[PDB]
Design an enzyme around this catalytic site. Structure first.
Site, PDB file in Angstrom:
ATOM      1  CD  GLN A   1     -50.828  17.708  -5.967  1.00 26.27           C
ATOM      2  OE1 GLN A   1     -49.773  17.960  -5.386  1.00 26.27           O
ATOM      3  NE2 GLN A   1     -51.437  18.582  -6.759  1.00 26.27           N
TER       4      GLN A   1
ATOM      5  CB  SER B   1     -53.422  16.107 -15.776  1.00 29.54           C
ATOM      6  OG  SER B   1     -52.237  15.330 -15.814  1.00 29.54           O
TER       7      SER B   1
ATOM      8  N   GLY C   1     -47.147  14.175 -18.573  1.00 26.21           N
ATOM      9  CA  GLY C   1     -46.716  12.997 -19.303  1.00 26.21           C
ATOM     10  C   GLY C   1     -47.330  11.722 -18.758  1.00 26.21           C
TER      11      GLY C   1
ATOM     12  CG  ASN D   1     -56.706  19.417  -6.373  1.00 23.69           C
ATOM     13  OD1 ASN D   1     -56.847  19.740  -7.554  1.00 23.69           O
ATOM     14  ND2 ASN D   1     -55.576  18.896  -5.903  1.00 23.69           N
TER      15      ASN D   1
ATOM     16  CG  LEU E   1     -72.867   8.015 -12.783  1.00 26.27           C
ATOM     17  CD1 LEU E   1     -73.445   9.382 -13.126  1.00 26.27           C
ATOM     18  CD2 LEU E   1     -71.453   8.143 -12.241  1.00 26.27           C
TER      19      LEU E   1
ATOM     20  CD  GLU F   1     -82.432   4.738 -14.126  1.00 31.55           C
ATOM     21  OE1 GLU F   1     -82.415   3.879 -13.218  1.00 31.55           O
ATOM     22  OE2 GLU F   1     -83.339   5.589 -14.240  1.00 31.55           O
TER      23      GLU F   1
HETATM   24  N1  LIG Z   1     -56.786  20.851 -10.576  1.00 28.55           N
HETATM   25  C1  LIG Z   1     -55.542  20.397 -10.470  1.00 28.55           C
HETATM   26  N2  LIG Z   1     -54.734  20.313 -11.587  1.00 28.55           N
HETATM   27  C2  LIG Z   1     -53.464  19.848 -11.483  1.00 28.55           C
HETATM   28  C3  LIG Z   1     -52.964  19.452 -10.250  1.00 28.55           C
HETATM   29  N3  LIG Z   1     -51.691  19.035 -10.434  1.00 28.55           N
HETATM   30  C4  LIG Z   1     -51.377  19.157 -11.744  1.00 28.55           C
HETATM   31  N4  LIG Z   1     -52.463  19.667 -12.404  1.00 28.55           N
HETATM   32  C5  LIG Z   1     -52.553  19.943 -13.848  1.00 28.55           C
HETATM   33  O1  LIG Z   1     -51.938  18.882 -14.552  1.00 28.55           O
HETATM   34  C6  LIG Z   1     -51.208  19.361 -15.664  1.00 28.55           C
HETATM   35  C7  LIG Z   1     -49.841  18.682 -15.706  1.00 28.55           C
HETATM   36  O2  LIG Z   1     -49.970  17.303 -15.434  1.00 28.55           O
HETATM   37  P1  LIG Z   1     -49.368  16.631 -14.101  1.00 28.55           P
HETATM   38  O3  LIG Z   1     -50.414  15.761 -13.446  1.00 28.55           O
HETATM   39  O4  LIG Z   1     -48.893  17.712 -13.161  1.00 28.55           O
HETATM   40  O5  LIG Z   1     -48.086  15.783 -14.594  1.00 28.55           O
HETATM   41  P2  LIG Z   1     -47.974  14.193 -14.337  1.00 28.55           P
HETATM   42  O6  LIG Z   1     -49.314  13.518 -14.502  1.00 28.55           O
HETATM   43  O7  LIG Z   1     -47.381  13.936 -12.971  1.00 28.55           O
HETATM   44  O8  LIG Z   1     -46.969  13.626 -15.460  1.00 28.55           O
HETATM   45  P3  LIG Z   1     -45.393  13.934 -15.390  1.00 28.55           P
HETATM   46  O9  LIG Z   1     -45.133  14.947 -14.300  1.00 28.55           O
HETATM   47  O10 LIG Z   1     -44.939  14.474 -16.725  1.00 28.55           O
HETATM   48  O11 LIG Z   1     -44.648  12.653 -15.105  1.00 28.55           O
HETATM   49  C8  LIG Z   1     -51.078  20.869 -15.508  1.00 28.55           C
HETATM   50  O12 LIG Z   1     -51.740  21.530 -16.563  1.00 28.55           O
HETATM   51  C9  LIG Z   1     -51.781  21.200 -14.211  1.00 28.55           C
HETATM   52  O13 LIG Z   1     -52.645  22.296 -14.398  1.00 28.55           O
HETATM   53  C10 LIG Z   1     -53.773  19.535  -9.121  1.00 28.55           C
HETATM   54  O14 LIG Z   1     -53.347  19.188  -8.020  1.00 28.55           O
HETATM   55  N5  LIG Z   1     -55.063  20.008  -9.237  1.00 28.55           N
END
Ligand SMILES: Nc1nc2c(ncn2[C@@H]2O[C@H](COP(=O)(O)OP(=O)(O)OP(=O)(O)O)[C@@H](O)[C@H]2O)c(=O)[nH]1
Ligand SMILES: Nc1nc2c(ncn2[C@@H]2O[C@H](COP(=O)(O)OP(=O)(O)O)[C@@H](O)[C@H]2O)c(=O)[nH]1
Ligand SMILES: [Mg+2]
Ligand SMILES: [Mg+2]
EC number: 3.6.5.-
Lengths: 433, 428, 487
Positions: A14, A136, A140, A224, A248, A250
Site C-alpha cells: 500500500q 512493516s 507476519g 501513506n 544517496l 554518498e
Molecule cells: N503507514 C501504513 N502502515 C500500515 C499500512 N498497512 C498496514 N500497516 C501497518 O502494518 C502493521 C501490520 O502489518 P501488515 O503489513 O498489515 O501485515 P502483513 O505484512 O500483510 O502480514 P500478514 O497480514 O500477517 O500476512 C500494522 O501495525 C499497521 O500499522 C498502510 O497502508 N500504511
C-alpha cells in the site's frame, strides 16, 4: 544505475502504491505507462523504470503478499496497466501477524517464486545498484517473509546493497498485539543483511497528520501519502540529475559509522494542508528539521549525540541561503556530535519542486527539505519495543503460536539478546574519549 | 484464510445454528430461496466466507443422532436453503448421554459427517477454519461434537477450530447429568479448540428474566440473544474490516495461552423479541453497557477477574473518534481490571452496517479470568453428584471407565487454577 | 562451489581458495578423487595468477598446504607440477609487492624443489626471470635462487658443469645491475656458490670480472663465514633422501475354543456384539494361557479379523481390547510372527496410532512393541519410516516414538552393515529430520530425542554432517536428549 523496489505485505504494497503514484506524477508518466515524446531531454529516471520496445515505462518493482486481497486492488485500480502481472505475486493463506508463519511455514512456499521474478528484473538491468525493501514491523509477512527474503538476497545478490523502509508499529493503528514480538524478530534476522534502514514510526506520521494537516483520525491513505513524500525525497537523488544533486549512496557513507548503526532518523518539512493561504524560507524549513514534532520516529535528539546530519533539499533552494541557515542553527541550537565525528553537514539540492497528489491533503510548496540524521536518540524506539517485548515474553504469552509454526523458542531469546547488545552499542557510541 | 465451514450438532446446536443462519442471511440480503435481494455491495464483498455459489447456499453441515430436529429445521423459514446432502442424521438418539454421542452411537455416525466435511472442504479455494454450535450439557452436541472436533483436528491440523458452546444451568433444563456432560466436554474443548465462546444459559435466563422482564422465558427468548451475540462476534469475518479479519488473526490477538481460549461475550443494547427500542444509544452508553455484567452472556462478574485480551466490535454509523475516547476511558479508569503485562490488549473495530432492527449496536468479546467462576460452578455440581456416583452406570455401560470422570474433573480444576494464576501475576 | 574458484566476483573466488585450503588439510592420506588437482595442474596455475591480490594470496597459501599434502606416496607426478607451477610462482608470486604473497610463494618453490630429485629442473625455469625488466622480480628470485642452493645444494644433478656455468653466466651482469638490491642479493648468491666450492674456482671464473670494491666485499663476506669449505651436510634434504529359558512350558491350543457365534457377532452392526465377542476370547481364551501352539496352528485367520477392527472399527473400545489380544498373541507365541503374522497387524496398528485416548494409545503401542521384540526390523523399519511422513500429526509423533523404542532395544546380530546402517542416511536420518523440522513443538521434541537416540548408537561424528544443516537452536535440543538418552 537501476534499483529494484520490493514491497512486502499490506504496508509495503500500500505504500508502494502511494510512492509509485508520486513517482509517476514527478516524472510525468501516465497510468498506462506512456509518456510524451522528449522533443534527449535529460531522461536519470530510468534507474527506477524500464522501457518496453513500444515506449512503455514499467516500474522496476515487485509486489509480494501472502494474501491476494491487497494486490488484487492494484491489478484492478488505476495502475492495473502500469505493472506487468508477473510483478504482482500473491499467495492464498497469509501469516496472521505471525513472524514464524511468514518466515518458516507459509513464506517458504513462495520464496523460490519471488526470487525468480526478481531475477527477471535483475536480468533486465545493465547495472544493478541495489534493492529497496518496503515492509512493516508488526505484520507476519512484513516481518517474517521480509527477513527471509533478506537472507536470500544476501546469498544470491551478495554484492548489491539493500535498503529497507520499515513501518515502526504504533497502538493508534495497531492491528495485532504480538507486533512487538514480530518487530524484534525481524530486526534481529535482518540486522546483518541490511545496509540502511529508514524506520517510520506510525505514531509520528499519525500525529503529524493530526497536527499539521488537521485530520481527526488519519486513514492509511493519509499516512501513506505523507510517507511517500519522504520516500520520494530520499530516492530523488537516484531518480534525477542535478549539478548539486548528491547521490544517496554518498550519504550512506556518512550515515553509517558502523554496520549495526544503520538506522537514520528522517525529518521532513514543511508539511502544510491545503485549506488556507500560506511560503517558507530556507532557514525556516531547515529550523523545522530540528523540531522533534517533525520527525518520523518519536525520540528526542537533544537527549542524544549526532553522528551524521544530511540535508536533502528540493525546490527553489540556493546554496548560500543554506549555509546561512546552517550557520545560524549550528550556533543557536544544541546539536551534540560525538567527539570522533567531523561535525559537518552534508547538503544536496534538487531544483525540482516537491510534487503532491492532486486534490490530496498536502499543499504544493516552493521548497522542501528532508533531513537524514544518524543520532543515538533513535535507540529510544528500540527501548519502547524491547519493553513491550519483555512484558509479554516474561510470561511466554503468545509464544505457542510462534513455536507452533516451526520456530524454536530460543530464537526469541537470541533476538532479544541482539536487541540488548544493539542498545549497548548505541550507548557506547555516544561516549567521548 | 477465506471460507469457513460451519457445523451444528445436537438439539441445541441445530436450534441456535438455524437461528444464526436466519440472521446473517437477512443481513447479507439472502431470502430463503437462496437469491440475493439486498442493496449494498458490502453484503456481497465477503459472502464467500459462509456461503457458496449457486446456479447462494450456506456452507453448513447439520448433525444429530435424533432425526427430530432434522425436520424442525427443514420446516423452518430458512429450512429450504440448506444443502439436502449436508443433513447427516442418525437412527437412535443420545439420551442426553455424553458417552453415547462420543464413544458409542456418535462414533458410528461420525464417519458419515467427515464425508460431508471433506466435500465442502474440497470446494474451498483456501479453507480458513471450522465453526461448531452445540451444547455442553447434552448428549449429541456435547459427546459427538467433541468427537467431531478431535476428528477434524486430526484431518485438518492447519485450520482454526472455533466453537459456540452453550453452558447448562438448573434454571433451564432439569436434567441432572448435565454437569457430567459439560465437565467431559470442557475437558475436550480445552485441548482441541483454538477458541470457544462460552454461552451461559444461566446468564441468558437471568437476562430475559431480570432485564427484559419476562416471567417465563422460552428457548426462543434465549436463542434470540444467542443469534444476536453470534452475529456480532462474526461481524469482522463477513464484512470488509481491518482488525481481526480471519479466524487465526483473532485467535492470535485473543489467546495468550493455549488452554485459556474461553471467551466471555457481551452485547448491547439488550433488545426484546419484536419490541420497541428505537432511539439508537449514544456511544458513551454503548461502552458503559458493554463492560458491565448485566450484558455478559456468561454468569461471571468481570470485577472478580482481569481481562487478558478484549475485542470490541461497534456497528452502525457513528463517530469513530468518539469511540476511541470512550474505549480509552474505560481502560485507564478501570486499569486494575486489565492486564498490564499485555500492552494494548483491547482492540476496537467498527462496521458501518448495523444488525437489522437497530442503528447502533456493540458486541464484546473478552478473555477474562473471571470465566473461572463459570467452571467453578460446573465443577461444584459435578462433584456433588460424582461423590455419590449417581447415574455413572450410564457412562460406564457405554464403555467409559470411572477414571475418565476423575481426569476431566482434575483438568477442569487445573484450568480454573490457571485462570487464577494469571489473575494474580503482576508487572513489577 | 568447486567451480566458483574461477568465478567472476573476487569474494566467491576468495571463498573457494579457503575451502580448498581446508580440504587439503582435512582430507584423507592413503585421497579423494575430488582432490584431482594433481592431474590438472592448470587449475592452480590459474589460481596463482588471480587478478585480485587478496584472493591471490589465499590461492597461494592453499597451494602451499596442498603442496605439502601431496608429500604422500605415490606421487612421482611432481615433475609435471614444477613445469606448470613455478613459472607462475616466480612471475607473479616472487614479483609481488606483498610481503605475505611473496613469502608463501618462496615457500611453495621450496616444496616443489624437494619434490624433485635435484635442483636443476627448478633452476632452469627461474633462470630466464633473471633477465626481467622489473628489478624487484630479479631482486627477489636471485635471493630465492640463492636460498635453494644454501639449503638444497648441488647433489644428484646430471651435469653440474652445465648447471654451474648456466648460473654463473648472468652473475657479472647481475652484479653491475642499476638496482641496489639486485646487486646486494647477487653478492649473497656468490657467497652461496663460494660456500659449496672453494675460493679458487670463482676467482678463476667470476671474481676477476667484478668491481674491485665488490670483490673486496666478498672477501670480507668469506672471512665472516666460519663453516668448513664445503658444508658437511645439506641444511635441507630432498624427499627421496628422507625416504631411502523358562519357556519349556507345554504349548496350549486355543484355536479350538472359538465359538460358532463369533465371526457373525464380530461382524455385526451392533457395537456390543463386537465388543463382547472380542472380550470373551480375550479374557477366557487368551488371558488364562502363557504358551500357545507354534506348530500346526494358523492364527493368520484370527489375526486379520483383529486388524480389521483395529484399522476400521469406529468403536474405540473394541480397538483397545483387540490390540491387547495382538500383544498377548505375539507375547505367548515367541518366534511365530515370521512374516505373515507380523505383517497382517503391523500397518493397521501404525494407522490406528491416530487415537489419542491414553488407554487406547497404550494398547496399540504396547502391541507395536511386542511385535517389534520378535520382528526387529523385518517390515517395521521400512514401514515405520513411511508413517513418520504421514499427513496426521498424531501418527507422526507416535510412529517416531516407536522407532526410538526399537532403536533403544537395538542389539542386532552384528558385526556391522545391518539394515539400519545402509538406511542410516539414505532414508532413516531423512525421515527423522522431517520430524525435527516439523511445524509443531511436541512433534519436533520427539525427533530431537529420536535423533539423540540415534547418535547414541552410531558415533556422533558420523552424523555431524546433517547436524550442521540444522539450526544452532535445534542442535541444543538434540544435544539436550543426548545426555538423558542411553542404550
Ligand atoms: N503507514 C501504513 N502502515 C500500515 C499500512 N498497512 C498496514 N500497516 C501497518 O502494518 C502493521 C501490520 O502489518 P501488515 O503489513 O498489515 O501485515 P502483513 O505484512 O500483510 O502480514 P500478514 O497480514 O500477517 O500476512 C500494522 O501495525 C499497521 O500499522 C498502510 O497502508 N500504511
Ligand atoms: N440456549 C439454548 N439452549 C438449549 C436449547 N436447546 C437445548 N439447550 C440446552 O442444551 C442442553 C441439552 O442439550 P441438547 O441439545 O438438548 O442435547 P443434544 O441433542 O444431545 O445436543 C440443556 O442444558 C439445554 O439448556 C436452545 O434452543 N437454546
Ligand atoms: Mg496482509
Ligand atoms: Mg434437551
Amino acid at each position: 544505475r537501476e534499483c529494484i523496489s520490493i514491497h512486502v505485505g499490506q504496508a509495503g504494497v500500500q505504500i508502494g502504491n502511494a510512492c509509485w503514484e508520486l513517482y509517476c506524477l514527478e516524472h510525468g508518466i501516465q497510468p498506462d505507462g506512456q509518456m510524451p515524446s522528449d522533443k534527449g531531454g535529460g531522461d536519470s529516471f530510468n534507474t527506477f523504470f524500464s522501457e518496453t520496445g513500444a515506449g512503455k515505462h514499467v516500474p522496476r518493482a515487485v509486489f509480494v503478499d501472502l494474501e491476494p486481497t491487497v494486490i488484487d486492488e492494484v491489478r484492478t485500480g488505476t495502475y492495473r496497466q502500469l505493472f506487468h502481472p508477473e510483478q504482482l505475486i500473491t499467495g492464498k493463506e497469509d501469516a496472521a501477524n505471525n513472524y514464524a508463519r511468514g518466515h518458516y511455514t507459509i513464506g517458504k512456499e513462495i520464496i523460490d517464486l519471488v526470487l525468480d521474478r526478481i531475477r527477471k528484473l535483475a536480468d533486465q538491468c545493465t547495472g544493478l545498484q541495489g534493492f529497496s525493501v518496503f515492509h512493516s514491523f508488526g505484520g507476519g509477512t512484513g516481518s517474517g517473509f521480509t527477513s527471509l527474503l533478506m537472507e536470500r538476497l544476501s546469498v544470491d545478490y551478495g554484492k548489491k546493497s539493500k535498503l529497507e523502509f520499515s513501518i515502526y508499529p504504533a497502538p493508534q493503528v495497531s492491528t495485532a498485539v504480538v507486533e512487538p514480538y514480530n518487530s524484534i524478530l525481524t530486526t534481529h534476522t535482518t540486522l546483518e543483511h541490511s545496509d540502511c534502514a529508514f524506520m517510520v514510526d506510525n505514531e509520528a506520521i499519525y500525529d503529524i497528520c493530526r497536527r499539521n494537516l488537521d485530520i481527526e483520525r488519519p486513514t492509511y491513505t493519509n499516512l501513506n501519502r505523507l510517507i511517500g513524500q519522504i520516500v520520494s525525497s530520499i530516492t530523488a537523488s537516484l531518480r534525477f540529475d542535478g549539478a548539486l544533486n548528491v547521490d544517496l549512496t554518498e550519504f550512506q557513507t556518512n550515515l553509517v559509522p558502523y554496520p549495526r548503526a544503520h538506522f537514520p532518523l528522517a525529518t521532513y518539512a514543511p508539511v502544510i494542508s491545503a485549506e488556507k493561504a500560506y511560503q517558507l524560507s530556507v532557514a525556516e524549513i531547515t529550523n523545522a528539521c530540528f523540531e522533534p514534532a517533525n520527525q518520523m520516529v518519536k525520540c528526542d535528539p537533544r537527549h542524544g549525540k549526532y553522528m551524521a546530519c544530511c540535508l536533502l533539499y528540493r525546490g527553489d533552494v540556493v546554496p548560500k541561503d543554506v549555509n546561512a541557515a546552517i550557520a545560524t542553527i549550528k550556533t543557536k541550537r544544541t546539536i551534540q556530535f560525538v567527539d570522533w565525528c567531523p561535525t559537518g553537514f552534508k547538503v544536496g539540492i534538487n531544483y525540482e519542486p516537491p510534487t503532491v497528489v492532486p486534490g490530496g491533503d498536502l499543499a504544493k510548496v516552493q521548497r522542501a527539505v528532508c533531513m537524514l540524521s544518524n543520532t543515538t536518540a533513535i535507540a529510544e524506539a528500540w527501548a519502547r519495543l524491547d519493553h513491550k517485548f519483555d512484558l509479554m515474553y516474561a510470561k511466554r504469552a503468545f509464544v505457542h503460536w510462534y513455536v507452533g509454526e516451526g520456530m524454536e523458542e530460543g530464537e526469541f531469546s537470541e533476538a532479544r539478546e541482539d536487541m540488548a547488545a544493539l542498545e549497548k552499542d548505541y550507548e557506547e557510541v555516544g561516549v567521548d574519549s | 484464510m477465506r471460507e469457513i465451514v460451519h457445523i451444528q450438532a445436537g438439539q441445541c446446536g441445530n436450534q441456535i445454528g438455524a437461528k444464526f443462519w436466519e440472521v446473517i442471511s437477512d443481513e447479507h440480503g439472502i431470502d430463503p430461496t437462496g437469491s440475493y435481494h439486498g442493496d449494498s455491495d458490502l453484503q456481497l464483498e465477503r459472502i464467500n466466507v459462509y456461503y457458496n455459489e449457486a446456479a447462494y447456499v450456506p456452507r453448513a453441515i447439520l448433525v444429530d443422532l435424533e432425526p427430530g430436529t432434522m425436520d424442525s429445521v427443514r420446516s423452518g423459514p430458512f429450512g429450504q436453503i440448506f444443502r439436502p446432502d449436508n443433513f447427516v442424521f442418525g437412527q437412535s438418539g443420545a439420551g442426553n448421554n455424553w458417552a453415547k454421542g462420543h464413544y458409542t452411537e456418535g462414533a458410528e455416525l461420525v464417519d458419515s459427517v467427515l464425508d460431508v466435511v471433506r466435500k465442502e472442504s474440497e470446494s474451498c479455494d483456501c479453507l480458513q477454519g471450522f465453526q461448531l454450535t452445540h451444547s455442553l450439557g447434552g448428549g449429541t452436541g456435547s459427546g459427538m461434537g467433541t468427537l467431531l472436533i478431535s476428528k477434524i483436528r486430526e484431518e485438518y491440523p492447519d485450520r482454526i477450530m472455533n466453537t459456540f458452546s452453550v453452558v447448562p444451568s438448573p434454571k433451564v433444563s432439569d436434567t441432572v447429568v448435565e454437569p457430567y456432560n459439560a465437565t467431559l466436554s470442557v475437558h475436550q474443548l480445552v485441548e482441541n479448540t483454538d477458541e470457544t465462546y462460552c454461552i451461559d444459559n444461566e446468564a441468558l435466563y437471568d437476562i430475559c428474566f431480570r432485564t427484559l422482564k419476562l416471567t417465563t422465558p422460552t428457548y426462543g427468548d434465549l436463542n434470540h440473544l444467542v443469534s444476536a451475540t453470534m452475529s456480532g462476534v462474526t461481524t469482522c469475518l463477513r464484512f470488509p474490516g481491518q482488525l481481526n479479519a480471519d479466524l487465526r488473526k483473532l485467535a492470535v490477538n485473543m489467546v495468550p495461552f493455549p488452554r485459556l481460549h474461553f471467551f466471555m461475550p457481551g452485547f448491547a443494547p439488550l433488545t426484546s423479541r419484536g419490541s420497541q427500542q428505537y432511539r439508537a444509544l449514544t456511544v458513551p452508553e454503548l461502552t458503559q453497557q458493554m463492560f458491565d455484567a448485566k450484558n455478559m452472556m456468561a454468569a461471571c462478574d468481570p470485577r472478580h477477574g482481569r481481562y487478558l485480551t478484549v475485542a470490541a466490535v461497534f456497528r452502525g454509523r457513528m463517530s469513530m473518534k468518539e469511540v476511541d475516547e470512550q474505549m480509552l476511558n474505560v481502560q485507564n479508569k478501570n486499569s486494575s481490571y486489565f492486564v498490564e503485562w499485555i500492552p494494548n490488549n483491547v482492540k476496537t473495530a467498527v462496521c458501518d452496517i448495523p444488525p437489522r432492527g437497530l442503528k447502533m449496536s456493540a458486541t464484546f468479546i473478552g478473555n477474562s479470568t473471571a470465566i473461572q467462576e463459570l467452571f467453578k460452578r460446573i465443577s461444584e455440581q459435578f462433584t456433588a453428584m460424582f461423590r455419590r456416583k449417581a447415574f455413572l452406570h450410564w457412562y460406564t455401560g457405554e464403555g467409559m471407565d470411572e477414571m475418565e470422570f476423575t481426569e476431566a474433573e482434575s483438568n477442569m480444576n487445573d484450568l480454573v487454577s490457571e485462570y487464577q494464576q494469571y489473575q494474580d501475576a503482576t508487572a513489577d | 562451489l568447486e567451480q566458483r574458484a574461477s568465478h567472476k566476483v573476487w569474494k566467491a573466488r576468495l571463498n573457494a581458495y579457503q575451502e580448498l585450503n581446508n580440504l587439503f588439510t582435512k582430507s584423507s592420506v592413503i585421497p579423494n578423487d575430488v582432490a584431482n588437482y594433481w592431474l590438472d595442474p592448470e587449475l592452480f596455475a590459474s589460481y596463482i595468477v588471480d587478478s585480485n591480490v587478496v584472493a591471490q594470496e589465499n590461492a597461494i597459501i592453499a597451494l602451499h598446504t596442498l603442496l605439502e599434502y601431496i608429500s604422500q606416496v605415490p606421487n612421482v607426478s611432481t615433475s609435471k607440477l614444477r613445469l606448470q607451477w613455478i613459472p607462475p610462482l616466480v612471475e607473479k608470486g616472487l614479483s609481488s609487492s606483498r610481503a605475505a604473497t611473496k613469502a608463501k610463494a618462496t615457500d611453495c618453490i621450496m616444496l616443489l624443489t624437494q619434490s624433485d630429485t635435484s635442483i636443476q629442473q627448478t633452476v632452469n625455469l627461474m633462470l630466464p626471470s633473471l633477465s626481467n625488466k622489473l628489478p624487484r622480480l630479479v631482486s627477489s628470485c636471485v635471493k630465492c635462487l640463492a636460498t635453494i642452493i644454501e639449503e638444497f645444494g648441488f647433489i644428484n644433478v646430471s651435469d653440474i658443469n652445465i648447471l654451474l656455468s648456466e648460473i654463473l653466466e648472468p652473475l657479472p651482469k647481475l652484479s653491475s645491475h642499476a638496482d641496489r638490491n639486485v646487486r646486494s642479493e647477487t653478492m649473497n648468491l656468490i657467497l652461496q656458490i663460494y660456500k659449496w666450492f672453494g675460493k679458487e674456482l670463482l676467482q678463476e671464473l667470476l671474481l676477476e670480472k667484478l668491481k674491485p670494491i665488490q670483490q673486496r666485499d666478498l672477501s670480507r663476506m668469506f672471512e665472516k663465514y666460519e663453516g668448513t669449505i664445503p658444508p658437511k651436510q645439506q641444511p635441507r634434504l630432498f624427499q627421496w633422501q628422507k625416504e631411502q529359558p523358562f519357556e519349556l512350558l507345554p504349548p496350549s491350543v486355543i484355536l479350538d475354543k472359538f465359538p460358532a457365534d463369533f465371526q457373525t457377532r464380530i461382524s455385526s452392526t451392533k457395537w456390543k456384539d463386537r465388543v463382547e465377542a472380542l472380550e470373551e476370547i480375550h479374557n477366557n481364551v487368551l488371558k488364562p494361557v502363557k504358551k500357545l501352539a507354534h506348530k500346526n496352528q494358523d492364527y493368520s485367520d484370527y489375526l486379520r479379523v483383529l486388524a480389521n477392527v483395529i484399522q476400521k472399527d469406529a468403536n474405540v473400545q473394541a480397538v483397545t481390547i483387540a490390540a491387547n489380544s495382538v500383544q498377548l498373541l505375539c507375547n505367548s507365541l515367541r518366534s511365530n510372527f515370521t512374516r505373515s503374522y507380523g505383517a497382517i497387524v503391523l500397518v493397521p496398528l501404525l494407522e490406528r496410532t491416530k487415537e489419542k485416548k491414553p488407554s487406547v494409545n497404550e494398547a496399540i503401542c504396547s502391541a507395536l512393541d511386542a511385535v517389534a521384540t520378535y520382528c526387529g526390523f523385518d517390515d517395521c523399519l521400512e514401514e515405520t519410516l513411511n508413517y513418520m511422513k504421514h499427513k496426521t500429526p498424531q501418527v507422526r509423533i507416535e510412529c517416531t516414538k516407536f522407532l526410538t523404542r526399537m532403536l533403544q532395544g537395538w542389539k542386532s546380530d552384528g558385526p556391522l552393515q545391518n539394515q539400519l546402517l545402509f538406511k542410516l542416511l539414505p532414508e532413516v536420518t531423512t525421515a527423522v529430520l522431517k520430524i525435527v523440522n516439523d511445524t509443531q513443538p511436541t512433534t519436533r521434541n520427539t525427533g530431537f530425542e529420536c535423533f539423540a537416540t540415534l547418535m547414541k548408537l552410531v558415533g556422533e561424528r558420523e552424523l555431524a554432517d546433517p547436524l550442521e544443516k540444522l539450526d544452532n537452536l535445534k542442535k541444543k535440543k538434540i544435544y539436550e536428549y543426548y545426555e538423558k538418552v542411553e542404550v
